[PDB]
Write an enzyme that holds these catalytic residues in place. Structure first.
Site, PDB file in Angstrom:
ATOM      1  N   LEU A  41       0.835  -1.191   0.000  1.00  0.00           N
ATOM      2  CA  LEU A  41       0.000   0.000   0.000  1.00  0.00           C
ATOM      3  C   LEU A  41       0.876   1.249   0.000  1.00  0.00           C
ATOM      4  CD1 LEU A  41      -1.670   0.749   3.429  1.00  0.00           C
ATOM      5  CD2 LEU A  41       0.345  -0.669   3.256  1.00  0.00           C
ATOM      6  N   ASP A  42       0.374   2.301  -0.635  1.00  0.00           N
ATOM      7  CA  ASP A  42       1.202   3.428  -1.038  1.00  0.00           C
ATOM      8  C   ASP A  42       1.456   4.393   0.115  1.00  0.00           C
ATOM      9  OD1 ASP A  42       1.509   2.550  -3.656  1.00  0.00           O
ATOM     10  OD2 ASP A  42      -0.355   3.522  -4.297  1.00  0.00           O
ATOM     11  N   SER A  43       2.032   5.539  -0.243  1.00  0.00           N
ATOM     12  CA  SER A  43       2.458   6.541   0.725  1.00  0.00           C
ATOM     13  C   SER A  43       1.272   7.234   1.378  1.00  0.00           C
ATOM     14  CB  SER A  43       3.346   7.559   0.010  1.00  0.00           C
ATOM     15  OG  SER A  43       2.621   8.209  -1.029  1.00  0.00           O
ATOM     16  N   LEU A  44       0.227   7.480   0.597  1.00  0.00           N
ATOM     17  CA  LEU A  44      -0.862   8.339   1.033  1.00  0.00           C
ATOM     18  C   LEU A  44      -1.684   7.656   2.117  1.00  0.00           C
ATOM     19  CD1 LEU A  44      -3.975   9.601   0.364  1.00  0.00           C
ATOM     20  CD2 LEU A  44      -2.005  11.114   0.288  1.00  0.00           C
ATOM     21  N   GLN A  46      -0.493   5.294   3.942  1.00  0.00           N
ATOM     22  CA  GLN A  46       0.440   5.212   5.065  1.00  0.00           C
ATOM     23  C   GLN A  46       0.344   6.442   5.959  1.00  0.00           C
ATOM     24  OE1 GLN A  46       3.723   6.788   6.912  1.00  0.00           O
ATOM     25  NE2 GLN A  46       3.988   7.030   4.708  1.00  0.00           N
TER      26      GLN A  46
END
Ligand SMILES: CCCCCCCCCCCCCCCCCC(=O)OC[C@H](COP(=O)([O-])OCC[N+](C)(C)C)OC(=O)CCCCCCCCCCCCCCCCC
Lengths: 87, 176, 157, 60, 171, 459, 119, 55, 128, 111, 68, 59
Positions: A41-44, A46
């Site tokens: 799952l990506d940065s956003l 996170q």
């Protein structure tokens, strides 16, 4: 004003509110397992996770430290540095 | 303006704008579930052009994003009661006595607390034991003439504690 | 002991001398040392800085002096006494500055204008005078013990 | 010899002393003179503290 | 003890409370316990003290003074004459300020006794107040700081010369 | 009085013929016994001043200030160690004996009938103070400070001598009583204007007024604690004492010719309270506080009301005590951290914990604490100047606001908020420091109880 | 009210301007009617320590209420109807003042419009 | 950590609502009447209090 | 979608809409690199002289000393009396003084005239 | 009457003793808050009774003594009055502040 | 197993100074108050009689309090 | 109840010792505001009556 804090209890609470959030799997979610590298799952989302921990434990964590959590064990490290969670 | 990097990257800047807008929408929106609705609407707005790599169109969108953030921000943001500006913001800084002191006491009152002062003596011996050689050589050998960062390397070499740890290990409890 | 040459006499000319000197002595960039310039007001050859500086400088950098917002080595801004947090909050206000003072002055002027319009135009319910019987409460006002009892009485209606 | 014989003794010594700048004398003198002035019919605190019979003003 | 002809106490008035109550009466039980617990033992100690007063006794006197004559009866310079004259005048000035203080204390007492009705039953005291202070304002007021006696007498000449020319212009 | 002078003479060879490590107790004990015998003076009553040994007399303009000097001596004698304990025996004994001779010329100044004797003992008050500040100043501009000091005080106070001699041989003697009881009113020609301007300009230099005031703050901030306290309290209140004496002549012209000094004094009062709002160097704020109070005193003496004179002498005594104490607190902080600047030594509520009580108490007596003697003095000055003119109260109240503001700034910036945690040399507070706090703030509170002792001879 | 609205919006004539209330002469719509009992007995009024602006009409009722309120203090709600009567008498006093204002109003109205119609 | 098992705080809140339900009437009842009450109001001028608070 | 937020002498312009933090050139990043080098070296010598156990006094901060000598007594050299300096001096010194002089002469002349009339309200005006 | 003046002066002076208690302390009293709460409670219950006397009859008085600096034509002493406002104002504030003493035992327990 | 080490600044010198202050006012405060009380309760004040005929008093016999 | 003993007797005893003797030798000391008599009142002091208030009517 008497909150008691300890290591493994707050490890349980962090791991619990990561388990409650839906789009991760509850199967391969170790205590020290990554966020971006293995779950994918990506940065956003996170940083939405970081928002969840801040909204749970009652103190903001800064954007200088928000780059570098990346797994629940390092999260428990930084929170135990915040509230001085040892005996 | 930050310790390790000389500057913040653009992905970092977009991310801090995200956290600020999300925080002020928390402060804007009561009942928490219509908050959840509007937050996913905001996340949809960032999903609208998330997969584009025109860096100049990206920073164009970032400038218009800063404009649309400042247009509808909230006057008193909901800041937590340990944040800067918060309700406490080092409330008990009253009760935060430094630990270089406590040794200008009287030997009667020192003899009232035996074991803590004996263990403090062996702490201070731990400090003076490995202060000079290992710490000073690792700080005058491994850095460049211009240091060009501030993160200091740990004592991976042989033995004792990583360098310059006294006033960082020995900080108070933040709730005494 | 301290050197006299870490103080700051003279002005900023010429362009080699004082510029290299102020960069090496104030621990700054060479061009970003900007003197005042020589307005003649004294002021030495000390730098010009962007003057706001204290409710800026984000608290999470974690420098040395935790409330003064310092770094132990800095040009030490000239009007710093006028700027420490508790003195002057130059944070960006959420609206403007002209628009702030326009709304404030408008509301104050409006309330004082309507105060004046109220002052010329009182209220009164349909009410007579308070009838005081003994020559309008005479011999219980300020005095005249036996000088002039002046006849004024009330009549039944 | 700064507190126990200086400060406390000075406090007793300025606590009571004579009528400093002649105070209670003036109380009792004023009481006697006002009893006199309101007994014997005369106006209390007559003006012209010196008698104008003892004056020779310049004239025109 | 204190002289009542100079501190005029007006005639006392006290009504008897007449219940017409059946709660009854917290203040009666209050004042009974107050008398028996406070008024008796303090009176016993005070009577012990007054017997200790009556063991042996003292006296203190009023320091009476003469009347040295005048300042209009001293010459040009004559410092030994003016010293007597001006210490006489300064003693008059001290006792005269105390007279003003006594009139003001009378006015305070008149105001407090008549309570919420000020404007009757204080006429005579306010009238004698304005008389004494008209005397004081006309006589000793605007002489500043270094009163010796002589500036008072220059004021005296100036004021009566003003009233002389006033009665000449209105004679 | 001569029984108050001659043991101060005999107290001078005490330090000489006492051996080392024994001089200290001797000087302390004996000067305190002199302070008891000093407070025994207070016999003053009613009609006259008490006049004897023909040169000597005591008003109540002179009794409280004389007791102030003869009580502020041993306090200072104790106060001035830890900065010369490590100096030598000879310079130690010389320092102490120089202070004693300074006291002797001070008391000679305060009990001066003859105004030429007053002027001689005036510049006799001057001459040791320069040697004190210049030899033990412990900074680098103290030299220039002493030089400015002596030339300002002399050249202002120099033609005062010529005017007094002119008085001496145009009228007769200069007994203060025969200056009184004989004073003819002098008219408004131009020579009378110059004579008044000469005497008033000399003491305007001494107070200072606003236009001649940079005399003082360099001399305060570059001095030892003994010279700083004697300088501030005793010298400025001596200038006020001398003006209260010499104003008895030249009455019927000073109304006409004493306007512009009021305007200079009030606008300087506001500018002085504003300049001590924003400086660094904690030591300087108390000097500018002193200039603010003395400008208010000068307003009080140029008006001629007994209310004004009672408020004047009360303001003198109270600010002498307050500014002397707060100088001593500044010296204690500077001996804790060898800085002299302000913002370095933050914190100090936590550490040195009951030092905070004495900062609080001294700063509230500077604040005009609501029963304090400072408030009594400022209040009666404000009453008398309102009777002088109905418009002056804006400058007085604005002075009050800014005075409270810089007092509170001094309180909550030097001693509030955060220890700077790179310091690690400040000890707990010694017993001597708390002893000096006690020796300052017992007489101010005792005078707050019964103050009718120390009000002016226009009582 | 509406008279206030007419006095500020319409003419300023027909509403008499307040606190200058007697403009028409007395005993003019009265003729031969005034008693004004005023049975407070002014001497006993001043010997009582009532406040100024209380030495008013119906003050005997107030004296009755002060008598019962002195005589029955710890009785918490005994003295009702005397102060009720004082309220009623001062209600009638307000009614009389209203009667005065509207008498003056209708005199000014009917008089001045009859006069300025036929003149 | 919602916790109010405190005798102190229930004493304080207890006795201040006691003073906030009865004691206003204990005060306002037997005040010595030091003014003259108006008490003759029209309609919509005594009802205006409750009207404004309800709206 | 905004009126673009003019700054003032007080309303400081925050780091978002600069827009100078967009057209980043070479010397901008070179300046940020050297600026981090300066802050790095100063914190390095600070933390060296801050963690020493032999350290007794204060850390002896030179820049605060330098600014103190700047603001205190290095005002006067240099100084030349120019047009601006002298004109602003004669305005800020003599101006309000002569203003208060005129208003005090005004009130005192009004008071002396009114008490020379004879009708001052000195009904009792004792404490003068 | 003795009773009214004596009780109002002791309601003043019973707000003097805990300052004397810390000034004669030289200890660590762990019950000094309890001391201050109970002397406040005693002060209120001794102060409500003279107000009850005021509304029962009156006898509405001023006390004054201990003059100091009676300099020129005035004088000023310790002088204070009990009348309507000064009478009924006090027990309200005493009751409020006694409640705040309780709540500051609890809320400020852990400092 | 709950109590900690609260760092205090110091208390020794402070309580030493306050104890010495209270004892060294107490040393001749209590004999002074006892003495002034014994004087003005066991010798009495004075009496307000007038100057008798043919008697000259000294500079005392003018004051209420006997130590005055 | 040693606490109740000291704090409602010892300052009470001292202040009532203070409020008779010394303070009444001060002459214009504490002054009462007089109770308010009525036409239906008599006087406790000597005993002399006031004629009552007159006719009521028109209620
Ligand atoms: C400041 C300068 C003050 C000079 C001393 C004051 C003085 O005496 O001035 C008058 C003196 C001269 O005035 P005078 O004191 O000689 O007064 C005139 C008196 N007769 C006419 C008898 C000679 O002038 C100066 O001192 C010069 C300036």
């Amino acid at each position: 004003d008497a909150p008691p804090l300890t290591l493994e209890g707050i490890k349980d609470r962090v791991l619990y509110v990561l388990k409650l959030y839906d789009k991760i799997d509850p199967e391969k979610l170790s205590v020290n397992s990554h966020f971006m590298k293995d779950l994918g799952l990506d940065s956003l989302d996170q940083v939405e996770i970081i928002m969840a921990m801040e909204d749970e434990f009652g103190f903001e964590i800064p954007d200088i430290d928000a780059e570098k959590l990346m797994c629940p064990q390092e999260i428990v490290d930084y929170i135990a540095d915040k509230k001085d969670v040892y005996e | 303006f930050l310790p390790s990097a000389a500057y913040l990257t653009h992905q970092q800047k977009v991310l801090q704008l995200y956290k600020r807008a999300l925080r002020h929408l928390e402060s804007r929106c009561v009942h928490r579930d219509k908050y959840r609705y509007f937050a996913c609407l905001l996340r949809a707005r960032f999903d609208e052009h998330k997969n584009e790599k025109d860096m100049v169109k990206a920073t164009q969108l970032l400038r218009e994003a800063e404009k649309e953030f400042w247009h509808g921000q909230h006057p008193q943001p909901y800041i937590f009661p340990e944040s800067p500006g918060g309700t406490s913001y080092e409330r008990y800084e009253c009760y935060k006595v430094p630990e270089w002191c406590l040794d200008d006491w009287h030997p009667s009152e020192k003899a009232m607390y035996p074991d803590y002062f004996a263990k403090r003596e062996q702490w201070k011996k731990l400090r003076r034991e490995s202060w000079e050689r290992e710490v000073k050589q690792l700080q005058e050998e491994t850095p460049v003439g211009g240091p060009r960062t501030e993160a200091l390397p740990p004592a991976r070499k042989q033995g004792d504690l990583p360098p310059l740890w006294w006033h960082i290990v020995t900080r108070p409890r933040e709730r005494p | 002991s301290h050197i006299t040459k870490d103080m700051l006499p003279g002005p900023y000319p010429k362009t080699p001398e004082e510029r290299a000197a102020a960069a090496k002595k104030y621990n700054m960039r060479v061009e970003d040392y900007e003197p005042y310039p020589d307005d003649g007001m004294g002021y030495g050859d000390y730098p010009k800085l962007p003057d706001r500086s204290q409710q800026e400088r984000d608290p999470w950098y974690d420098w040395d002096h935790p409330d003064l917002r310092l770094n132990w080595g800095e040009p030490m801004h000239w009007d710093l006494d006028m700027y420490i947090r508790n003195r002057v909050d130059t944070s960006p206000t959420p609206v403007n500055w002209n628009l702030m003072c326009k709304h404030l002055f408008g509301f104050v002027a409006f309330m004082l204008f309507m105060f004046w319009v109220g002052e010329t135009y009182p209220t009164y319910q349909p009410v007579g005078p308070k009838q005081y019987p003994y020559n309008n409460l005479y011999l219980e006002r300020g005095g005249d013990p036996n000088k002039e009892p002046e006849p004024v009485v009330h009549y039944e209606i | 010899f700064g507190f126990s014989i200086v400060l406390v003794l000075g406090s007793t010594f300025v606590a009571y002393l004579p009528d400093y700048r002649m105070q209670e004398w003036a109380r009792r003198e004023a009481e006697r003179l006002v009893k006199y002035r309101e007994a014997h019919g005369l106006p209390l605190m007559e003006s012209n503290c010196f008698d104008p019979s003892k004056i020779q003003l310049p004239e025109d | 003890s204190w002289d009542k002809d100079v501190y005029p106490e007006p005639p006392r008035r006290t009504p008897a409370p007449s219940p017409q109550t059946s709660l009854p009466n917290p203040i009666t039980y209050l004042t009974k316990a107050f008398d028996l617990l406070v008024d008796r033992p303090v009176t016993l100690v005070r009577e012990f003290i007054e017997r200790q007063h009556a063991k042996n006794k003292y006296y203190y006197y009023h320091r009476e003074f003469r009347r040295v004559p005048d300042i209009t009866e001293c010459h040009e310079k004559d410092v030994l004459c003016m010293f007597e004259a001006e210490m006489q005048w300064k003693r008059d000035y001290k006792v005269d300020q105390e007279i003003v203080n006594i009139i003001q204390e009378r006015l305070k007492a008149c105001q407090q006794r008549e309570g919420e009705s000020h404007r009757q039953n204080c006429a005579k005291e306010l009238q004698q107040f304005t008389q004494v202070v008209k005397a004081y304002q006309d006589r000793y007021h605007d002489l500043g700081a270094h009163y010796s006696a002589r500036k008072c007498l220059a004021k005296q000449k100036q004021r009566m010369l003003a009233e002389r020319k006033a009665t000449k212009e209105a004679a | 009085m001569l029984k108050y002078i001659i043991p101060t003479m005999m107290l001078m060879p005490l330090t000489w013929l006492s051996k080392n490590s024994m001089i200290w107790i001797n000087t302390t004990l004996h000067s305190l016994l002199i302070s008891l015998t000093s407070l025994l003076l207070l016999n003053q009553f009613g009609d006259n001043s008490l006049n004897f040994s023909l040169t000597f007399f005591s008003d109540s303009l002179s009794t409280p200030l004389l007791i102030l000097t003869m009580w502020l001596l041993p306090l200072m004698l104790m106060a001035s160690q830890h900065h010369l304990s490590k100096e030598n025996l000879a310079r130690k004994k010389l320092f102490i004996s120089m202070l004693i001779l300074l006291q002797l010329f001070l008391i000679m100044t305060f009990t001066a009938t003859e105004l030429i004797f007053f002027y001689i003992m005036f510049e006799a008050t001057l001459v040791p103070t320069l040697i004190i500040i210049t030899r033990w100043g412990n900074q680098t501009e103290r030299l220039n400070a002493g030089l400015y000091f002596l030339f300002y005080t002399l050249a202002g106070s120099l033609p005062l001598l010529v005017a007094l001699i002119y008085i001496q041989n145009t009228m007769g003697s200069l007994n203060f009583l025969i200056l009184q009881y004989w004073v003819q009113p002098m008219p408004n020609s131009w020579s009378n204007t110059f004579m008044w301007l000469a005497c008033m300009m000399a003491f305007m230099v001494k107070m200072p007024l606003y236009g001649l005031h940079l005399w003082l703050p360099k001399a305060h901030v570059e001095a030892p604690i003994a010279g700083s306290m004697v300088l501030a309290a005793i010298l400025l209140k001596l200038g006020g004492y001398g003006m209260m004496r010499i104003t008895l002549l030249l009455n019927p012209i000073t109304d006409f010719m004493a306007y512009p000094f009021i305007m200079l004094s009030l606008w300087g009062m506001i500018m002085t309270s504003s300049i001590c709002l924003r400086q660094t160097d904690l030591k300087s704020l108390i000097a500018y506080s002193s200039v603010s109070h003395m400008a208010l005193v000068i307003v009080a003496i140029l008006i001629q009301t007994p209310w004004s004179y009672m408020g004047a002498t009360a303001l003198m005594i109270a600010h002498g005590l307050t500014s002397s104490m707060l100088f001593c607190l500044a010296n204690s902080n500077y001996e804790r951290v060898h800085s002299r600047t302000m913002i370095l030594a933050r914190g100090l509520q936590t550490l040195l914990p009951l030092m905070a009580a004495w900062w609080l108490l001294a700063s509230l007596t500077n604040l005009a604490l609501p029963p304090s003697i400072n408030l009594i003095g400022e209040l009666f000055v404000v009453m008398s100047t309102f009777s002088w003119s109905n418009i002056t109260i804006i400058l007085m109240g604005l002075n009050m606001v800014i005075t409270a503001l810089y007092s509170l700034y001094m309180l909550i910036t030097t001693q509030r908020g955060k220890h700077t945690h790179h310091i690690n040399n400040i000890l707990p507070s010694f017993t001597r420091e708390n002893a000096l706090m006690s020796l300052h703030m017992l007489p101010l509170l005792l005078l707050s109880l019964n103050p009718k002792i120390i009000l002016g001879p226009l009582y | 009210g509406a008279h206030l609205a007419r006095r500020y919006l319409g003419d300023a004539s027909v509403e008499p301007e307040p606190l200058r209330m007697p403009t028409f002469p007395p005993d003019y719509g009265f003729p031969e009617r005034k008693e004004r009992e005023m049975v407070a007995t002014q001497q006993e009024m001043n010997d009582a320590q009532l406040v100024l602006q209380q030495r008013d009409y119906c003050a005997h009722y107030l004296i009755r209420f002060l008598k019962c309120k002195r005589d029955s203090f710890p009785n918490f709600l005994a003295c009702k109807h005397e102060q009720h009567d004082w309220d009623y008498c001062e209600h009638l006093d307000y009614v009389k003042r209203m009667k005065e204002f509207e008498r003056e109003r209708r005199l000014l109205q009917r008089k001045k419009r009859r006069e300025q119609r036929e003149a | 950590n919602i916790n109010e098992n405190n005798p102190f705080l229930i004493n304080s809140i207890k006795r201040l609502l006691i003073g906030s339900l009865f004691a206003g009437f204990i005060i306002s009842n037997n005040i010595p009447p030091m003014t003259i009450p108006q008490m003759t109001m029209p309609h919509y001028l005594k009802m205006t209090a409750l009207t404004v608070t309800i709206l | 979608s905004f009126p673009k937020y003019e700054p003032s002498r007080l309303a400081s312009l925050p780091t978002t809409l600069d827009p100078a933090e967009y057209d980043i050139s070479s010397e901008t990043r070179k300046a940020q690199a050297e600026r981090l080098a300066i802050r790095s070296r100063l914190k390095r010598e600070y933390q060296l002289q801050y963690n020493d156990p032999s350290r007794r006094g204060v850390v002896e901060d030179p820049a605060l000393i330098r600014w103190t000598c700047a603001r205190s007594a290095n005002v006067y050299p240099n100084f030349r009396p120019n047009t601006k300096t002298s004109l602003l001096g004669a305005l800020f010194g003599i101006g309000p003084l002569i203003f208060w002089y005129y208003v005090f002469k005004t009130d005192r002349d009004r008071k002396e005239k009114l008490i020379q009339e004879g009708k001052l309200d000195r009904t009792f005006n004792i404490s003068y | 009457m003795n009773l009214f003046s004596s009780l109002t002066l002791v309601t003043l002076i019973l707000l003097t003793m805990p300052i004397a208690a810390i000034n004669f302390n030289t200890h660590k009293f762990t019950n000094y808050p309890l001391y201050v709460k109970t002397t406040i409670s005693c002060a209120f219950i001794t102060s409500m009774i003279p107000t009850m006397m005021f509304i029962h009859t009156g006898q509405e008085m001023i006390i004054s003594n201990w003059h100091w600096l009676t300099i020129q034509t005035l004088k000023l002493s310790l002088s204070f009055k009990m009348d309507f406002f000064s009478m009924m104002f006090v027990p309200v504030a005493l009751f409020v502040t006694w409640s705040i003493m309780e709540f500051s035992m609890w809320y400020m327990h852990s400092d | 197993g709950k109590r900690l080490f609260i760092i205090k600044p110091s208390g020794f010198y402070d309580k030493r100074f306050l104890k010495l202050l209270r004892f060294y006012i107490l040393l001749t405060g209590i004999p002074v108050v006892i003495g002034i009380t014994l004087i003005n309760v066991f010798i009495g004040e004075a009496e307000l009689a007038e100057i008798p005929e043919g008697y000259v008093p000294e500079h005392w016999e003018y004051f209420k309090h006997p130590i005055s | 109840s040693i606490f109740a003993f000291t704090h409602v007797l010892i300052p009470v005893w001292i202040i009532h010792y203070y409020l008779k003797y010394h303070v009444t030798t001060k002459p214009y000391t504490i002054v009462e505001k007089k109770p308010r008599i009525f036409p239906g009142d008599t006087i406790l002091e000597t005993g002399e009556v006031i004629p009552p208030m007159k006719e009521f009517p028109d209620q």
